[PDB]
Design a protein around this motif. Structure first.
Motif, PDB file in Angstrom:
ATOM      1  N   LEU A  52       0.737  -1.140   0.081  1.00  0.00           N
ATOM      2  CA  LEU A  52       0.004   0.031  -0.038  1.00  0.00           C
ATOM      3  C   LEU A  52       0.671   1.415  -0.038  1.00  0.00           C
ATOM      4  CD1 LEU A  52      -2.643  -1.146   2.660  1.00  0.00           C
ATOM      5  CD2 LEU A  52      -3.056  -0.851   0.128  1.00  0.00           C
ATOM      6  N   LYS A  53       2.115   0.930   0.324  1.00  0.00           N
ATOM      7  CA  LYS A  53       2.763   2.188   0.337  1.00  0.00           C
ATOM      8  C   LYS A  53       3.893   2.523  -0.953  1.00  0.00           C
ATOM      9  CE  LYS A  53       2.227   2.955   4.653  1.00  0.00           C
ATOM     10  NZ  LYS A  53       1.781   4.602   5.428  1.00  0.00           N
ATOM     11  N   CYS A  54       3.739   1.558  -1.915  1.00  0.00           N
ATOM     12  CA  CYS A  54       4.479   1.627  -3.225  1.00  0.00           C
ATOM     13  C   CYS A  54       3.872   2.626  -4.214  1.00  0.00           C
ATOM     14  CB  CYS A  54       4.554   0.278  -3.803  1.00  0.00           C
ATOM     15  SG  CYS A  54       5.492  -0.911  -2.879  1.00  0.00           S
ATOM     16  N   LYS A  55       4.597   3.349  -4.786  1.00  0.00           N
ATOM     17  CA  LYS A  55       4.120   4.294  -5.721  1.00  0.00           C
ATOM     18  C   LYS A  55       3.724   3.372  -7.070  1.00  0.00           C
ATOM     19  CE  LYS A  55       2.476   6.417  -8.793  1.00  0.00           C
ATOM     20  NZ  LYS A  55       3.310   7.612 -10.047  1.00  0.00           N
ATOM     21  N   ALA A  56       4.511   2.402  -7.242  1.00  0.00           N
ATOM     22  CA  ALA A  56       4.274   1.494  -8.660  1.00  0.00           C
ATOM     23  C   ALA A  56       4.693   0.084  -8.013  1.00  0.00           C
ATOM     24  CB  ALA A  56       4.894   2.150  -9.703  1.00  0.00           C
ATOM     25  N   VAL A  57       3.804  -0.925  -8.724  1.00  0.00           N
ATOM     26  CA  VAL A  57       4.132  -2.197  -8.604  1.00  0.00           C
ATOM     27  C   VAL A  57       4.420  -2.993  -9.867  1.00  0.00           C
ATOM     28  CG1 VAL A  57       2.961  -4.481  -7.723  1.00  0.00           C
ATOM     29  CG2 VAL A  57       3.144  -2.345  -6.303  1.00  0.00           C
ATOM     30  N   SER A  58       5.331  -3.832  -9.979  1.00  0.00           N
ATOM     31  CA  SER A  58       5.733  -4.477 -11.243  1.00  0.00           C
ATOM     32  C   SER A  58       5.074  -5.899 -11.156  1.00  0.00           C
ATOM     33  CB  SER A  58       7.062  -4.578 -11.494  1.00  0.00           C
ATOM     34  OG  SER A  58       7.369  -5.162 -12.911  1.00  0.00           O
ATOM     35  N   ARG A  59       4.109  -6.243 -11.999  1.00  0.00           N
ATOM     36  CA  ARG A  59       3.783  -7.634 -11.982  1.00  0.00           C
ATOM     37  C   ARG A  59       4.368  -8.707 -13.364  1.00  0.00           C
ATOM     38  NH1 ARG A  59      -2.339  -7.085 -12.975  1.00  0.00           N
ATOM     39  NH2 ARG A  59      -1.769  -6.828 -15.232  1.00  0.00           N
ATOM     40  N   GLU A  60       4.399  -9.815 -12.771  1.00  0.00           N
ATOM     41  CA  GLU A  60       4.587 -10.653 -13.872  1.00  0.00           C
ATOM     42  C   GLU A  60       3.750 -11.809 -13.777  1.00  0.00           C
ATOM     43  OE1 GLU A  60       9.127 -11.630 -13.841  1.00  0.00           O
ATOM     44  OE2 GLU A  60       8.932  -9.665 -15.186  1.00  0.00           O
ATOM     45  N   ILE A 107       1.710  -1.306 -12.471  1.00  0.00           N
ATOM     46  CA  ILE A 107       0.732  -0.924 -11.854  1.00  0.00           C
ATOM     47  C   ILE A 107       1.190   0.308 -11.016  1.00  0.00           C
ATOM     48  CG2 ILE A 107      -1.303  -1.262 -10.523  1.00  0.00           C
ATOM     49  CD1 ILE A 107      -0.411  -4.372 -10.863  1.00  0.00           C
ATOM     50  N   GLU A 108       0.314   1.273 -11.544  1.00  0.00           N
ATOM     51  CA  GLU A 108       0.523   2.909 -10.861  1.00  0.00           C
ATOM     52  C   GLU A 108      -0.683   3.006 -10.035  1.00  0.00           C
ATOM     53  OE1 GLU A 108       1.855   4.999 -14.230  1.00  0.00           O
ATOM     54  OE2 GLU A 108       3.892   5.393 -13.334  1.00  0.00           O
ATOM     55  N   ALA A 109      -0.387   3.583  -9.011  1.00  0.00           N
ATOM     56  CA  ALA A 109      -1.278   3.987  -7.685  1.00  0.00           C
ATOM     57  C   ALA A 109      -1.722   5.636  -8.520  1.00  0.00           C
ATOM     58  CB  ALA A 109      -0.907   4.012  -6.421  1.00  0.00           C
ATOM     59  N   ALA A 110      -3.144   5.747  -8.263  1.00  0.00           N
ATOM     60  CA  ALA A 110      -3.477   7.172  -8.822  1.00  0.00           C
ATOM     61  C   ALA A 110      -3.058   8.322  -7.641  1.00  0.00           C
ATOM     62  CB  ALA A 110      -4.871   7.112  -8.688  1.00  0.00           C
TER      63      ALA A 110
END
Ligand SMILES: CC(C)Sc1nnnn1-c1ccccc1
Length: 146
Positions: A52-60, A107-110
């Protein structure tokens, strides 16, 4: 329906093999080999609250498909107690029949996140799998933040 029949053959030939999420860092937050794309049952997943603290998450995302697809893509919605807070669109594109593929997405958070303790068990991620305009399947995953 000719379209209905095609969607079912694609679904029948489709498998989500494995998946992971990393801080965009590079650190693995979650990983699994459950096919979370299976429709008709509510999946459950446990994720680290720090996400919940990440500005962006990378998914594989690794998947197999017997069927050819021309424009494989996803629509994903985050629901909190039934209300959509956020929607994401991702495109893969052409898929070779009888291929296995690894699909990387950012995946970027708004917008400000509620605390994990409030969210946990009250978030659902609804995912729709598309071949262009043809809806192939809809699945749901309930999130717990740990
Ligand atoms: C079927 C979709 C691919 S589920 C999905 N999509 N992005 N993250 N994510 C996910 C990853 C781990 C736990 C809960 C949800």
């Amino acid at each position: 329906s000719a379209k209905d029949e095609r969607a079912r053959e694609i679904l029948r030939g489709f498998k989500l093999n494995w998946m992971n999420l990393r801080d965009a860092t590079g650190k693995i937050l979650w990983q699994g080999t459950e096919d979370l794309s299976v429709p008709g049952v509510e999946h459950e997943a446990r994720v680290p609250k720090k996400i919940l603290k990440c500005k962006a998450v990378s998914r594989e995302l690794n998947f197999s498909s017997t069927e050819q697809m021309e424009k494989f893509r996803l629509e994903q919605k985050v629901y909190f107690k039934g209300q959509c807070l956020e929607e994401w669109f991702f495109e893969f594109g052409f898929v070779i029949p009888n291929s296995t593929n690894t699909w990387q997405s950012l995946i970027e958070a708004a917008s400000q996140m509620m605390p994990a303790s409030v969210l946990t068990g009250n978030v659902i991620i609804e995912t729709k799998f598309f071949d262009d305009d043809l809806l192939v399947s809809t699945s749901r995953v309930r999130l717990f933040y740990v």
